[PDB]
Design a protein around this ligand. Structure first.
Ligand SMILES: CCCCCCCCCCCCCCCCCC(=O)OC[C@H](COP(=O)([O-])OCC(O)COP(=O)([O-])OC[C@@H](COC(=O)CCCCCCCCCCCCCCCCC)OC(=O)CCCCCCCCCCCCCCCCC)OC(=O)CCCCCCCCCCCCCCCCC
Ligand SMILES: CCCCCCCCCCCCCCCCCC(=O)OC[C@H](COP(=O)([O-])OCC(O)COP(=O)([O-])OC[C@@H](COC(=O)CCCCCCCCCCCCCCCCC)OC(=O)CCCCCCCCCCCCCCCCC)OC(=O)CCCCCCCCCCCCCCCCC
Ligand code: HEC
Ligand code: HEC
Ligand code: HEM
Ligand code: HEM
Ligand code: HEM
Ligand code: HEM
Ligand SMILES: COc1cc2[nH]c(C)c(-c3ccc(Oc4ccc(OC(F)(F)F)cc4)cc3)c(=O)c2cc1Cl
Ligand SMILES: COc1cc2[nH]c(C)c(-c3ccc(Oc4ccc(OC(F)(F)F)cc4)cc3)c(=O)c2cc1Cl
Ligand SMILES: O=C1C(O)=C([C@H]2CC[C@H](c3ccc(Cl)cc3)CC2)C(=O)c2ccccc21
Ligand SMILES: O=C1C(O)=C([C@H]2CC[C@H](c3ccc(Cl)cc3)CC2)C(=O)c2ccccc21
Lengths: 243, 360, 88, 243, 88, 360
């Protein structure tokens, strides 16, 4: 085994202490995820409820949910059936169980992405590096079929094929499509999905810390107020010196 | 009980020169009370089932009002519990407090053991990879006795039964903590605190106006810092790998305990015999216990001044601290021969400098 | 636990407009790669050295994955400085 | 609504304080349950493990479990399959969900029998009475199709058809079959299945209560030992009377 | 909670052998029912009375489920005394 | 704390003529301690999920060594808690203990309220039909205030969230109980107990030899009886209908609370206005509270002898007891006009004979 390298720091808009997420990037990342990465991965913790008002307008989200068949039941006869998805349903998944997922992916298991940036070191910088990382093998190394070389994956050999391809998807705001752009936008989307409460958390943090610091100044003054009366005291032995 | 309140926290008379280093006890108590509040309000929505514990913790964060805040305050205040305890211990190693505060020092050690147990039980409840495999390791470590491990587990392997009883135990232990704290303070105020100068003095001053305000000031700072780290996440205190669901047949490829457990981990990496491993912990704790009656180990009359200021010789406590920090460093890294070599050097230093405290 | 950790004093780029609406149908990385390739020349040197020595030794075991990994880590850590200037 | 009548008390062997269950009756009741009542009811809490040593020998219980197909999986391809039952499996059930059960039984739900005698008033006496209770309607009453009159069911109209029929089943010990006998044996079996720990509980009870009573006698003597010294005391005022 | 509750001073019957191995291919209840039918005659009387009156009143509403229920509860509470003597 | 032990439970001096009727406090305390032990060991294997709580309780009985014993001891000791409390209350109504044991009587009432709450929370945890619909009823009963009921439930209807918080609350309340018990005993020994004769006497005798043995004797009897009922099931204390899984859209066809709740149930059956219902409970409890300062409600100097022996007039407490028993009887039966009529008669008696205690 070896110590894997550390990724470079990219200037994502959010990684400042005063900045929020960047919602157009999040929309584009969601579009990428739907058109590409949802082929083999899952996000079992996400429901369409989460997108209205935070990322997308309600009407559009309902229309998105309507594109899927979702299973429900039992009915009066005790049978199961399929219906169009609704705002209350979780995202769909491509495989019914882990065994089928491994069967379709040569034995490896595609992890659920509901917390992916919180489940790796350097989070989004690691993911951004990983999506760039595919390269030809070095001299003296060969990989068995259905396995690929990536310079940022630990041990350098990974089961996921090269992920991105130019104009494999398209954007509704007009932005041009290329693997670098898709990388940035999908990493933004997944970082948001890892904890949608981020902006609430940070905006509350700011007020809290500011007020507490003002507090601290006031209490420091109050403490010194009492320090000074005994720090400046005079005690004499035998007879009085000064007055 | 009001008259006692006044006798011990208002009219009680201290020494004039008690600086901030004597404020950290109050601080650990406050982190205890705070951790208890957040504990109880987390229990109202937690699920103790192996099939669904993980998603139970995720539900708080995703779908509950202010759900995220209590989980993160609870997670982050633990680090401050341990940091304050270590400062509080080192202060009294530095001063040789245990010279006359014998039973207080013993009580302290018992409280630290309680805290270790409480934290580790907590660490299993979110039920991720690190939780499962940590529980596996520590339960295998106390194997020497037949049938004790399947009994304490409840089962042949870490199970839902194990989760249920860990949850109940983690519920109960803190309050036993509180009782022992009352005992601690009894022994303390039986004697009276020491000075930083280690002399006996009549220049005393009452508590309520002067020292209460310093307590309050430090309390403000601590509340500040907890909220800073909790809301913005400046430091990666906890590793990401507890974010992955458990798998009983595959370990995580890289392993790093919570920081307050790394030194111990380092030992388990470098000593060859497993029993030697466990015996190092037992021996070091016994050595610390032995300091309670240091006055008896010699016939020279003892003083509390260790004359460590301006001293090129430094002191055994400082070497202990630096050895412990070095062990944390090595704890964090991968297993490799050179790390193990400097590990063994640091381990020998850590053991020897603890043994030597008795040799005045 | 957290999705990310805050970084101090980060510098956020202004979007350099493409000179031709067609200009970024091709990946901007291609326009940053040459310079960085020139900056990491010592790793190219060592990788070619190891390649030669491995091909020579004739006891039929050898590889140069180390130096290759270092080369590409260098190049990437260079590219990361300017890539976000070309993306919206 | 009305107060339903109370059943008569039958002398089942177990309802004495010193008696156990009557195991041959339990075997015969199990046979009845398998051949008849398991057509529409379920016992989801029972596993074949429970029968070895308590009712039947292990070998026979394994052979019983082998008669059923039990579903298991997933396999390497992520598909489910069927296998012969084993000692570790729970009893099978005739319907996949409550909706199908209601669909097959004209809307009514056949309750799970895993605790049936503890889930009714007068338990086994009620069940014994109920199985006898089917009769023709009284003057001035008529019941809609698929509904029957029973003089012990509350409100007198019940959805379960007449349950028992002579020599509808057969016994391996040689006992003759008739509806009364089948009633007794199946009620015995269900009473056992409601709590298999009964005999353990009672045999432990006996020792406990006996020893505690002996205790009580000893403590009574000890208490009187001290009562008598102050109950017999003399106190005089002014001068001494007796000695 | 409990499967049953203990009853004091219960009397447990001895199994009266059948006089013919074929004798209990027919339900023993049939041999206890006549006697009890004779003992509960007042309920038969009242049920027949109500039957007559219901058939007479002519305002086209009436039933005798009460008295029927009482009749059969009586008969059953009689049969329960001897039925377990004939079962193993 | 040993010196206190000796002062209060060994050298404490009682009156010679304290008979068994003064032993039931000790008994309720013991049922508390015992119920706490069985509680904690039940918590180690219970599941707080609406999907699977029921089967969790069944697993203890079916698949765990001695699993059945703890559940049944816990179930049966509750009845004895309440029976002993009622005997303990009636003794002091009979003697007019509250004449001078003012704050003790108040503390008593608070403890009884705590016990009611604790029991009812426990009653929901096995999660059967009766549990669900009981919770529904009592939560609807405290509806008068907006949003308080969905808030306390956690939800628009009784839910898994409700189970989780009921479980935590049932965990916590008993220990608050214990604290209030210490307070109770403080007020008691501040004054000193009364005699059955209601006189003041110097013929006192110490506790350890004489009265301790009577306490022990009664303790033997109680342990006996608990085990008898627990192991053999002589009485149908609990109705069978909690043995059925919950259905949110169908009620059970016959309904009978636990016996210690039947009288209350009777009231809810017979008073037309729901608010009148609730106000009857509030009023009766307020009346009992009012007895604490009965010395002030009149200018005639008070005595504790109620002269109820040989008395054709009997006493209001006896009429109260018989009215309460009658209400239990009617509680148990179906809703029908005649039961309601005698219900209302008994209710008027129960209310009036409580009001009248103040009129000496
Ligand atoms: C400043 C200290 C702060 C301490 C914090 C401790 C950590 C707390 C953590 C938990 C949280 C608790 C919160 C409360 C903390 C206490 C607060 C307090 O009251 O402090 C009092 C503190 C000291 O009070 P005191 O009365 O002097 O105390 C007595 C002394 O201790 C003297 O006592 P004594 O003389 O009696 O001695 C007794 C002895 C008793 O012994 C002890 O107590 C020893 C304890 C040691 C610790 C042992 C445990 C360790 C366990 C392991 C921990 C591992 C953690 C790993 C963390 C990794 C992080 C990366 O103590 C000692 O000997 C201590 C002396 C140690 C000397 C060490 C010298 C080191 C030199 C390092 C030089 C580095 C150079 C780097 C150069 C780099 C160049 C590139 O004073 C202050 O802090 C003053 C307030 C300052 C406020 C400044 C705020 C500025 C904000 C600026 C904002 C800018 C914004 C800009 C915006 C711009 C916009 C444009
Ligand atoms: C015997 C009593 C037992 C009481 C038990 C209470 C229930 C406890 C339940 C919880 C468990 C606790 C366990 C400990 C219990 C206490 C044990 C104890 O030490 O008892 C002392 C007790 C009395 O001691 P003491 O020093 O006289 O007490 C002072 C007095 O209280 C005198 O005190 P005072 O003069 O200072 O008066 C103060 C006042 C203070 O006020 C109170 O304390 C009043 C409290 C009243 C209760 C209020 C709450 C009620 C709440 C509702 C409860 C509903 C429950 C529903 C249950 C339904 C059940 C179906 O008390 C009174 O006024 C009490 C007098 C009441 C007179 C009532 C007269 C009723 C007559 C009934 C006649 C019935 C005739 C039926 C004819 C039928 C014909 C067909 O003595 C004994 O029990 C002696 C030991 C006897 C052992 C015999 C064992 C025989 C075993 C035979 C086995 C055979 C086997 C055969 C085998 C054969 C094989 C062949
Ligand atoms: C099917 C062709 C896939 C598509 C489309 C995407 N992923 Fe995937 N991924 C897939 C497999 C079979 C694996 C296993 C790799 C292994 O070595 O076992 C993965 C793995 C990942 C990981 C894990 C990286 C790590 O260090 O563990 C990540 C972070 C990941 N994949 C991300 C990802 C993204 C962002 C995708 C959309 C651009 C995406 N994947 C698509 C299978 C497939
Ligand atoms: C399908 C033909 C069934 C067979 C065979 C058995 N039972 Fe059943 N049972 C069935 C239905 C549709 C119902 C519902 C009745 C209703 O009114 O809704 C029942 C009900 C019962 C009950 C409940 C009695 C009560 O008072 O609630 C019991 C105790 C019961 N059944 C027992 C029972 C036994 C012992 C059987 C074997 C002899 C048996 N049933 C067979 C459907 C069917
Ligand atoms: C000194 C006191 C305590 C300490 C040091 C402590 C420590 C911890 C720690 C370290 C965790 C891990 C949290 C995580 O990894 O995210 C935790 C979790 C938890 N603790 Fe404690 N705890 C204390 C008191 C309590 C109390 C009193 C309770 C309840 C009465 C409690 C209930 C819980 C619960 C429910 C969790 C689960 C958190 C989750 O699942 O996200 N804790 N505790
Ligand atoms: C929950 C854990 C603890 C709490 C709540 C606590 C609390 C306190 C408090 C309030 C004081 C007095 C004020 C102060 O010194 O800050 C004190 C003093 C002291 N404590 Fe602790 N303490 C804890 C752990 C420990 C430990 C682990 C040790 C030793 C290993 C210890 C040993 C001492 C000593 C020696 C003193 C007095 C020192 C002197 O007077 O010179 N305590 N403690
Ligand atoms: C005065 C003290 C207590 C009383 C009166 C009380 C009362 C009750 C009652 C009446 C039940 C219903 C059991 C049933 O219906 O089968 C119950 C159940 C339960 N109690 Fe308590 N309890 C007390 C103390 C405790 C304590 C201290 C704990 C835990 C620390 C506890 C934990 C439980 C649990 C887990 C159950 C569930 C039993 C089951 O699911 O079968 N109890 N309690
Ligand atoms: C957990 C509940 C309770 C406990 C553990 C408890 C305990 C005790 C004990 C140990 C005593 C002294 C010995 C004895 O009288 O048996 C006592 C006395 C007393 N208790 Fe309680 N008790 C409880 C509930 C109550 C209630 C509900 C009331 C009133 C409504 C009450 C009122 C009194 C009074 C008035 C006395 C003294 C009577 C006298 O001295 O004449 N207690 N209690
Ligand atoms: C800077 O110098 C000092 C600071 C000091 N700060 C404090 C806070 C105390 C102190 C703590 C507790 C106490 O009484 C209590 C015991 C136990 C409880 O229980 C629990 F759990 F803490 F709530 C509460 C309360 C009484 C006094 C000191 O003596 C003290 C002494 C010195 Cl020299
Ligand atoms: C027959 O006549 C009598 C019987 C009596 N029995 C008893 C048991 C006591 C008693 C109870 C508690 C106590 O101190 C304690 C308080 C609270 C605790 O806490 C807890 F929760 F109970 F464990 C423990 C301990 C001290 C004394 C009496 O005074 C007493 C008085 C009389 Cl006239
Ligand atoms: O290999 C280990 C390991 O060695 C420990 C160790 C760390 C030190 C702990 C400890 C040691 C001593 C004391 Cl007094 C308390 C805790 C025991 C568990 C872990 O915490 C761990 C967690 C997850 C996966 C693997 C591992
Ligand atoms: O209809 C009721 C009902 O009325 C109560 C009632 C009994 C009295 C209770 C009670 C009243 C007053 C106090 Cl201070 C404490 C408890 C509240 C619930 C039940 O317990 C119940 C349980 C199951 C199904 C239906 C019902």
């Amino acid at each position: 085994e070896k110590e894997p390298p550390h990724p470079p720091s990219y200037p994502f808009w959010f990684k400042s202490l005063f900045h929020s997420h960047d919602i157009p990037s999040v929309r584009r990342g969601y579009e990428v995820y739907r058109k590409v990465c949802a082929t083999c991965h899952s996000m079992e913790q996400l429901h369409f409820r989460h997108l209205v008002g935070e990322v997308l307008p309600e009407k559009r989200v309902k229309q998105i949910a309507a594109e899927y068949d979702v299973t429900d039941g039992p009915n009066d006869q005790g049978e199961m059936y399929t219906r169009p998805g609704i705002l209350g349903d979780a995202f769909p998944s491509p495989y019914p169980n882990e065994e089928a997922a491994r069967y379709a992916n040569g034995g490896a298991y595609p992890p659920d992405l509901s917390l992916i940036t919180a489940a790796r070191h350097f989070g989004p910088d690691y993911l951004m590096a990983l999506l760039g990382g595919y390269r030809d093998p070095p001299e003296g190394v060969e990989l068995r079929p259905g396995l690929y070389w990536n310079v940022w994956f630990p041990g350098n050999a990974i089961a996921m094929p090269p992920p991105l391809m130019d104009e494999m998807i398209d954007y509704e705001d007009g932005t041009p499509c290329n693997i670098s752009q898709m990388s940035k936008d999908v990493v933004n989307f997944l970082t948001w999905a890892t904890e949608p409460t981020a902006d609430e958390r940070k905006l509350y943090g700011l007020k809290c810390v500011s007020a507490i610091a003002i507090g601290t100044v006031l209490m420091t003054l109050w403490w010194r107020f009492y320090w000074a009366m005994y720090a400046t005291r005079r005690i004499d032995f035998g007879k009085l010196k000064y007055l | 009980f009001m008259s006692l309140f006044r006798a011990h926290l208002v009219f009680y008379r201290c020494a004039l020169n008690l600086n901030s280093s004597y404020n950290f006890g109050f601080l650990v108590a406050m982190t205890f009370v705070l951790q208890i509040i957040t504990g109880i309000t987390l229990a109202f929505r937690y699920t103790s089932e192996a099939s669904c514990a993980f998603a139970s913790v995720q539900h708080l964060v995703r779908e509950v009002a202010a759900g995220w805040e209590f989980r993160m305050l609870h997670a982050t205040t633990a680090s401050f519990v341990f940091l304050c305890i270590l400062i509080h211990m080192t202060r009294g190693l530095y001063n040789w407090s245990y010279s006359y505060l014998t039973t207080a020092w013993m009580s302290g050690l018992v409280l630290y053991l309680l805290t270790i147990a409480t934290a580790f039980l907590g660490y299993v409840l979110p039920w991720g990879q690190m939780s499962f495999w940590g529980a596996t390791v520590i339960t295998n470590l106390l194997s020497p006795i037949p049938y004790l491990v399947p009994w304490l587990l409840g089962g042949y392997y870490v199970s839902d039964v194990t989760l249920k009883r860990f949850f109940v135990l983690h519920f109960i232990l803190p309050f036993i903590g509180c009782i022992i704290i009352v005992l601690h303070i009894f022994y303390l105020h039986l004697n009276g605190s020491s000075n930083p100068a280690g002399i006996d003095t009549a220049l005393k001053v009452a508590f309520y106006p002067h020292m209460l305000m310093t307590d309050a000031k430090c309390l403000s700072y601590l509340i500040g810092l907890i909220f800073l780290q909790a809301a913005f996440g400046l430091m990666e205190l906890s590793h990401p790998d507890n974010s992955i669901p458990v798998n009983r047949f595959v370990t995580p490829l890289h392993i790093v305990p919570e920081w307050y457990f790394l030194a111990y981990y380092a030992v388990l990496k470098v000593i060859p015999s497993k029993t030697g491993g466990l015996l190092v912990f037992m021996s070091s704790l016994i050595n610390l216990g032995l300091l309670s009656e240091i006055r008896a180990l010699n016939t020279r009359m003892l003083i509390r001044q260790q004359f460590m200021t301006r001293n090129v010789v430094s002191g055994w406590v400082i070497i202990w601290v630096y050895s412990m920090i070095f062990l944390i460093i090595i704890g964090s890294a991968i297993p490799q021969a050179t790390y193990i070599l400097y590990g063994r050097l640091a381990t020998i230093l850590y053991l020897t400098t603890g043994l030597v405290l008795c040799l005045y | 636990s957290y999705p990310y950790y805050c970084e101090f004093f980060v510098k956020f780029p202004n979007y350099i407009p493409p000179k031709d609406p067609a200009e970024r149908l091709v990946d901007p990385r291609q326009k940053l790669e040459p310079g960085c390739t020139a900056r990491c020349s010592l790793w190219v040197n060592e990788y070619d050295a190891c390649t030669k020595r491995v091909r020579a030794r004739t006891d039929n075991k050898g590889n140069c994955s180390g130096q290759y990994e270092e080369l590409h880590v260098c190049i990437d850590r260079c590219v990361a400085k300017d890539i976000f200037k070309y993306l919206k």
